[PDB]
């Protein structure tokens, strides 16, 4: 009950000062998320310790820097648990992974509120532009069937799964947007892949997605009309992972000056599960 209604009065003259303190941990924690390809190319295994030593001179105490290895973009998109405070995610760009990278960026860079979806028993809808559905698991073959006012499937027969429309097939992660205001019947392989009704709150500003490779393709906003460039949608140019990591360490002061530690959650899950 932090009194989020009474106004706060500032002043436009006095004074530029310091931030006093905050006592819940000794200090912040930086947190790299790199693919296995970095380790394989580096061909080492004292390199995490070397990078910690090289962070120490930049001014991070030893215990603050953590490293997390993931198989690749698609295998990491499933339940991306950001166990940490200042998250960087080095995403190697690869052609045909454009929408997968956009999915992961839209998932972690923004703060989501997800409810369960019991597909077998209910139809489902979308409240507004801010409401997506997020399907995750080993294999998500999300076949939808929209229904008119009369509960007759338009372009599909509700009793014949074949007639359905496959919005996204065989994805580790799929953010699906169907038209807002029309009931749908969903069908996906509930043994492997789960699905959730996820509304989009404001942005999550612990996380910085560093596109390691090509052009600027991360379209976080599903709206085709908008395509903003966020300060955390980082992009760097690479030939070698050692060069990438060295740039990160060298410029880490700016990397954390663009983010903000405040927007953090108890659980490491990338969304608030509101049941």
């Amino acid at each position: 009950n932090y009194g989020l209604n009474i106004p706060i009065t500032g002043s436009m003259d006095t004074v530029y000062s310091n931030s006093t303190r905050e006592e819940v941990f000794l200090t912040s924690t930086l947190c790299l998320y790199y693919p296995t390809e970095a380790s394989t190319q580096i061909s080492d295994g004292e390199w995490k310790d070397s990078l910690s030593q090289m962070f120490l001179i930049k001014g991070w105490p030893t215990g603050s820097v953590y490293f997390k290895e993931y198989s690749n973009i698609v295998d990491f998109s499933v339940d991306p648990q950001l166990y940490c405070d200042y998250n960087l995610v080095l995403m190697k760009y690869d052609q045909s992974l454009e929408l997968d990278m956009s999915e992961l960026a839209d998932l972690i860079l923004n703060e989501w509120l997800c409810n369960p979806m019991d597909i077998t028993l209910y139809y489902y809808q979308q409240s507004g532009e801010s409401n997506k559905w997020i399907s995750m698991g080993s294999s998500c073959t999300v076949k939808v069937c929209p229904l008119n006012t009369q509960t007759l499937g338009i372009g599909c027969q509700t009793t014949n799964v074949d007639s359905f429309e496959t919005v996204a097939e065989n994805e580790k992660l799929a953010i699906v947007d169907v038209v807002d205001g029309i009931n749908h019947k969903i069908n996906l392989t509930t043994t492997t892949c789960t699905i959730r009704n996820c509304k989009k709150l404001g942005p999550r500003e612990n996380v910085a997605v560093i596109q390691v490779g090509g052009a600027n393709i991360l379209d976080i906003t599903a709206d085709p009309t908008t395509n903003p460039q966020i300060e955390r949608m980082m992009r760097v140019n690479w030939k070698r992972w050692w060069q990438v990591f060295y740039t990160i360490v060298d410029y880490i002061n700016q990397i954390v000056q663009v983010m903000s530690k405040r927007s953090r959650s108890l659980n490491s899950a990338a969304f608030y599960y509101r049941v």
Binding site: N115, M117, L121, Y122, Y123, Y124, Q125, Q126, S127, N131, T149, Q150, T151, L152, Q157, T158, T159, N160, S163, N183, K185, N197
Partner: protein, 486 residues
């Protein structure tokens, strides 16, 4: 919290009549009863691109019993009571099918159909005569015309199938039913001998609409296959909905409630616009009246009038008499039309503002709410009688005052002189009772005109003081709203 869902479908209804026969003894010439009987039927048909399986049950009502009996001789032909259907008789065809719509048929907001008529014609029955010329039943026909759909249920062997019942009317047709080779010609109507004419099925086609009320506790997430059937539904506890209704007063407003209370509320004005099912919108009003009759307040009205009638031929001391005549005044308030603001106005306003924002979920429960509020709302109230600018005020708890109109200072009370006038002079509900009125005059010094108006409980002056944002009247009316707690 309860969402409308349209389920309108085009269906083909196939059905066949059922024939029962009972033989009479002797050598096999007579018959005892030829009558229609309930008949089931199964089928499948293609519609909307899927094969839907349907189950129908036909039954007949209003049937005539013609007769024919050749005499007491042991071989003369006859049928003791052979039936027919004609103008009066109806035929019901309960219909069911596996489609999704019939799973969501528990709660319905509306339901009506458009079916195309059909012509049913009687077959040929050769009455089993052992020897001689063969008698011949033939002819007879009617036409089924649809009139009204309702809910129903097949008591099928494996389960009870909730279903739609189509009540078709009848219309006798051209072929004159006869008992050929026998003394009955140029009748008209469809007899029970062979109503199907050997047809595999009589067929109807139409479109039926339906507006179900599948529940919802969240906008995005609407169900299919309504499975909260009256096995899965049970009596909401009396204290539980009492607490719900008491909680609902969290939100009621101050001036808007008085604005509503200054309407004439009638049967149609209140009980219309209730988000209810078909089975409860049919008789909600009568259901409310049935339990309103037996309420303690209503039987008190009855006892008052009967006691007065019996008296017509039979021929803190003050607190008790004042309390008894206070109860009597409450009864008089309810029965008659008072020209004041009339506490029961506020009670009905609170009642409407409460029930409008609720829902009927398979049980009426306006009985036990309307009738209960009618007796419990505003437990302690007050009345007054003005005479010679010395208004005498009385409380149902037994208290009494007598104060001047021009200036609000009390006087010694006059028992048996208040009682002579309370019988005839019009009683004024004291929604601005003496205590609050004295506070108002002391703090916000008022004039003769508005003093008289507030004494009379004039809506104009009451709303003027409310819209002045007068704290005294505001708080008083707020407590008035707050005693409405069932």
């Amino acid at each position: 919290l309860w969402k409308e869902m349209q389920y309108n479908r085009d269906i083909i209804i196939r059905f066949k009549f059922g024939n029962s026969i009972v033989k009479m003894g002797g050598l096999g010439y007579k018959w005892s009863e030829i009558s229609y009987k309930a008949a089931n039927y199964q089928y499948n048909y293609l519609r909307d691109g899927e094969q839907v399986t349907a189950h129908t049950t036909c039954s007949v009502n209003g049937v005539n019993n013609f007769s024919y009996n050749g005499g007491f001789l042991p071989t003369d032909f006859g049928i003791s009571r052979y039936e027919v259907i004609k103008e009066n008789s109806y035929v019901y065809v309960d219909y069911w099918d596996d489609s999704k719509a019939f799973r969501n048929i528990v709660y319905v907001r509306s339901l009506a159909a458009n079916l195309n008529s059909v012509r049913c014609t009687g077959g040929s029955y050769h009455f089993s005569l052992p020897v001689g010329a063969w008698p011949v039943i033939n002819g007879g026909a009617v036409s089924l015309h649809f009139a009204g759909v309702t809910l129903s249920t097949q008591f099928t062997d494996f389960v009870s199938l909730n279903s739609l019942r189509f009540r078709f009317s009848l219309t006798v047709d051209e072929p004159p039913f006869s008992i050929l080779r026998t003394r009955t010609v140029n009748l008209y109507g469809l007899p029970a001998a062979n109503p199907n004419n050997g047809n595999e099925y009589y067929e109807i086609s139409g479109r039926f609409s339906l507006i179900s009320l599948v529940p919802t506790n969240d906008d995005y997430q609407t169900p299919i296959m309504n499975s909260v059937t009256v096995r899965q539904d049970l009596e909401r506890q009396l204290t539980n909905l009492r607490e719900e209704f008491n909680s609902l007063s969290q939100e009621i407003a101050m001036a808007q409630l008085i604005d509503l209370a200054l309407l004439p509320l009638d049967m149609f004005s209140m009980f219309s616009g209730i988000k209810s099912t078909i089975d409860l919108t049919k008789s909600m009003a009568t259901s409310v009246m049935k339990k309103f009759r037996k309420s303690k307040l209503a039987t008190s009205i009855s006892e008052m009038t009967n006691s007065l009638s019996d008296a017509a031929s039979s021929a803190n001391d003050i607190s008790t008499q004042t309390s008894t005549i206070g109860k009597k005044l409450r009864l008089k308030e309810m029965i008659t039309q008072t020209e004041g603001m009339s506490f029961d106005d506020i009670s009905a306003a609170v009642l409407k503002t409460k029930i409008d924002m609720s829902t009927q979920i398979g049980k009426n429960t306006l009985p036990d709410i309307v009738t209960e509020a009618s007796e419990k709302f505003i437990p302690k109230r007050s009345y007054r009688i003005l005479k010679d600018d010395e208004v005498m005020e009385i409380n149902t708890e037994g208290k009494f005052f007598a104060y001047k109109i021009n200036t609000f200072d009390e006087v010694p009370f006059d028992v048996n002189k208040f009682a002579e006038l309370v019988t005839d002079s019009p009683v004024i509900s004291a929604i601005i009772d003496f205590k609050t009125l004295k506070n108002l005059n002391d703090n916000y010094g008022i004039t003769r005109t508005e003093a008289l108006n507030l004494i009379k409980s004039n809506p104009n002056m009451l709303r003027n003081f409310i819209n002045q944002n007068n704290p005294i009247i505001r708080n008083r009316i707020e407590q008035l709203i707050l005693q409405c707690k069932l």
